Amino acid sequence: MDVSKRPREEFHKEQCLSFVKKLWAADTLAMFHYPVSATEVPGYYDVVDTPMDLSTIRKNIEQGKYRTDTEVENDVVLMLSNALDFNEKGSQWHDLAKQLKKRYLTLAQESGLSFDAD
User: Fold this and answer.
1) Would you say 53 and 35 are in contact if contact means Cβ atoms under 8 Å apart?
2) What keywords were assigned to this record (predicted)?
3) 84: three-class secondary structure by DSSP
4) How many C-beta neighbours within 10 Å does residue 11 have?
């Protein structure tokens, strides 16, 4: 495991929440804010096996269930991936997911976060 080789803090609660607040605001359609309601997006869970949204991420942060900052990146990436998969290219939904996939690393930087490439 080499736990001694880890930094003293692998999880920065405040920065992760700041990161999510930026994602929340960058979400121009409010599409990522809550778990999808099937009645508002019919068939959604017929495609998406592993749903993820910003409120769930925010909850996992607040309750300290994340072990590392990089787990937070992983769920953001999952979230955006679901949108890119479910939605058709050229749709406002797909376009946004694309923008956020291109931009989130900068948002993380600006929130003082640094993920692990490994």
Assistant:
1) yes
2) Bromodomain
3) helix
4) 16
The fold of the 1-118 domain, in CATH, is Histone Acetyltransferase; Chain A (1.20.920)
Contacts of 67 (CB under 8 A, 6+ apart): 10, 11
- Contact present, 35 and 55 (Cβ < 8 Å): yes
Instruction: Find the helix or strand (DSSP H, E) in which 28 lies.
Output: none
Helices vs. strands in the chain: H and E counts, helices first: 5, 0
Phi and psi of 110, rounded to 5°? -65, -15
Data resolution in angstroms: 1.9
- In whole angstroms, what is the distance from residue 89 CA to residue 118 CA? 30
Write out the H or E segment, with its range, that includes residue 41: none
Provide Rg for the chain, Cα atoms. 15
CB 87 within 8 A of CB 94: yes
Can you tell me the distance from the alpha carbon of 108 to that of 47, in angstroms, rounded to the nearest whole number? Answer: 29
